[PDB]
Design a protein around this ligand. Structure first.
Ligand SMILES: Cn1c(=O)n(C2CCN(CCCn3ccnc(-c4ccc(Cl)c(CNC(=O)c5ccc(F)cc5)c4)c3=O)CC2)c2cc(Cl)ccc21
Length: 217
């Protein structure tokens, strides 16, 4: 119903992270979604451990750490593992390590997650507004994406085949162009202080609504 939302205004989004040469966008996207659900229930915003997911949500979950993974099965790990550590106590090192999870430094838990219907930008809008930040995949193969500085991103050669985990933390519009407000994990010098606004309601642009998921506590 609201024409625009931004979950940063509601205190539900952490500092933008830097994944580096490790392709752990899936882990960053997943912890970002859970982070927001943590704040909604607990009142505490704390950066959760992407590295905990890279290291422990591995072969059983169809994830290859720094060679990519799924947010959906990352949520399953946190359910199965009965918690995830804080980034503070299990920080990010941009490589594949042995699983060093420690129940002592558990900062959050996960009960279930929800996978939204394929390519449905309307349902995604509902969830973003009413549930919270949604982990999504995008097609970020194209140099335009790498280079993005500002405004609403539209790449004509963008497919709906997704390779990169991001987190939709809102939506809105700019000069008529409707956008999704997407948190990336490529440091602060990417786009708009770490964020990118990508085309909304333009035939599932770059696959943004192809595989949306969010967790719950
Ligand atoms: C070993 N086993 C496994 O594999 N499953 C998959 C995970 C859950 N569903 C995924 C289908 C939905 N679906 C389809 C296509 N694309 C994405 C997708 C979404 C977000 C992102 Cl960011 C990406 C990008 N990721 C990668 O490119 C990548 C690269 C390397 C890698 F190792 C993993 C992923 C893709 C996506 O979610 C089915 C296959 C298992 C499921 C079970 Cl019950 C038991 C064992 C499993």
């Amino acid at each position: 119903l609201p024409d625009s939302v931004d979950w940063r205004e509601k205190g539900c989004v952490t500092e933008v992270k830097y994944q580096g040469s490790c392709g752990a966008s899936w882990a960053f996207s997943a912890v970002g979604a859970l982070e927001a659900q943590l704040k909604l229930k607990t009142g505490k915003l704390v950066s959760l451990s992407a590295q905990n997911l890279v290291d422990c949500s591995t072969e059983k979950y169809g994830n290859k750490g720094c060679n990519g993974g799924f947010m959906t099965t990352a949520f399953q790990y946190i359910i199965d593992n009965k918690g995830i550590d804080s980034d503070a106590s299990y920080p990010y090192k941009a490589m594949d390590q042995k699983c060093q999870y420690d129940s002592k430094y558990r900062a959050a838990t996960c009960s279930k997650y929800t996978e939204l219907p394929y390519g449905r930008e309307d349902v995604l809008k509902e969830a973003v507004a009413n549930k919270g930040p949604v982990s999504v995949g995008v097609d970020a193969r194209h140099p335009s994406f790498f280079l993005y500085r500002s405004g609403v991103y539209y790449e004509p050669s963008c497919t709906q085949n997704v390779n990169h985990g991001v987190l939709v933390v809102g939506y809105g519009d700019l000069n008529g162009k409707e956008y999704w407000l997407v948190k990336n994990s490529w440091g602060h010098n990417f786009g708009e202080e770490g964020y990118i606004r990508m085309a909304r309601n333009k035939g599932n642009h770059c696959g943004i609504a192809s595989f949306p998921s969010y967790p719950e506590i």
